[PDB]
């Protein structure tokens, strides 16, 4: 809580705007407003990894006491990181769930926004940072160390019955004096059945970046309805169960309903031009449903493509034969929905909810929003994150990537929209350059069993996919095709690998991988799994990214690495 | 006057002229309106429009005008020579004579 600490927020600070994300700029660009509200001058930062972290703060070495932590924290006992932390406060609103308690405890310059269903790490700092064996933090027979040292009385301290602390078992003797180590490893390790089961099994994330910030500012008599749309960007970034597990998807159908079915600054005069009060609507999260013809969707939909095999023609025979039950035209089924005749686009959605009942794809419809600025338009709630990431363009001019991070922050203004359609120049063509090796894949059958998973690697770059995140998508695009449709469950469901050719960046074998179908809540051991081969051997490995699921090799230090990675 | 449907006046009655005055938003530049005023920089005697403001205004007229379009456009001629000729003078000191224009969709 900071209803009290926000009262403190006057003196100098840094609002770093945390590592690569949608949600950051959503949950920060709000705050360039609030700072000019309370008359605060500011400074904000691009982060791509721990590289950026001190390479810049080493340039900003003050004692600036009010400091942020979002999308970060699972990196260092960050006093170990920022040793110039003496009393310089940090601020926690991070979504990275698995973090170390060393930054929770020693709670000098950190603030716990803590409420959760995990009472499993209670003394984990009281032993882990407290114990050791073959330990020197003790007295000795020598007359030099017969003084009050940091007598931790622990697995740090003596094993000759000179130690105040360690009331856990007997100190005179259990069966001998030296059984202290035995119980120390027992107590150390027997919980590492759970502790090292934490942080060495998988990784996943928490919650929002500005939902609290809405509620923080909800008290401030602030009906900045615009900011709600800024908010939902971060919501449907990863509340979407199509990407990341929410559950609260179906339980904030109450809350934000309880927000905005409640919150109505105009019950009487809301039907006019600028930013009419919003709606919730039961809609899709379909592949860019609105602005281009159906025949873009009916191919480019994974939820169609998962169940129907549409890269080939039987899908299309299945397609149109299901358009029998609608009896849609075809010319109209190849122009933009918004451009079609009108009773069709109007009437269209109403029947699809019901006459998708029988054709294996019933779960295309979800809950969403929709609103505008004026009368040029009706932008769409879900139709916004995807044009953004066309500006996350992996140009190697050395100027674009940092600077285009700034353009994003200039993007979500009402004033700045000419740029915005440029994404749509870029986005769709990506989305159908998607197939550009897929049907070359499913028929080449470039899926590799590779033991206890499924496995793929690409060996030729895309200027598109130099940029990293689509690597996950293509991985998420195909195993449905052959691996999930021509098989039984025993021979189908296993996770996958997805390599990234850096045909330009000197050769370093970038990669991501993902779980099998219908195993989502089974969080990915890939949170650690790639440490398997690396922990054993490791060869020039990197974890320079903030992300867990992310790596970087050499051109040729991947196969024997992968051979170690068999397990 | 046949005031049931297919009404012979609606457009010039109030509607399209005033929608055009509804083509009127902040920045004080959202206009299909002073377009002709910059045509009167030379007297080009024409104007441009869309077919996707009426969609941004309604869903009622777009399936309607398609029936009788070449009627609507001289209805619009009438609209103009009634509208801008209001704008030829604020208060009673300007009009030599009216004229005619064209519209571009």
From Swiss-Prot, chain B:
This is DNA replication licensing factor Mcm5. Acts as a component of the Mcm2-7 complex (Mcm complex) which is the putative replicative helicase essential for 'once per cell cycle' DNA replication initiation and elongation in eukaryotic cells. Core component of CDC45-MCM-GINS (CMG) helicase, the molecular machine that unwinds template DNA during replication, and around which the replisome is built. Belongs to the MCM family. Signal peptide: none annotated. It is found in: Nucleus; Cytoplasm, Cytosol. It comes from Drosophila melanogaster. The gene is Mcm5. Component of the Mcm2-7 complex. The complex forms a toroidal hexameric ring with the proposed subunit order Mcm2-Mcm6-Mcm4-Mcm7-Mcm3-Mcm5.
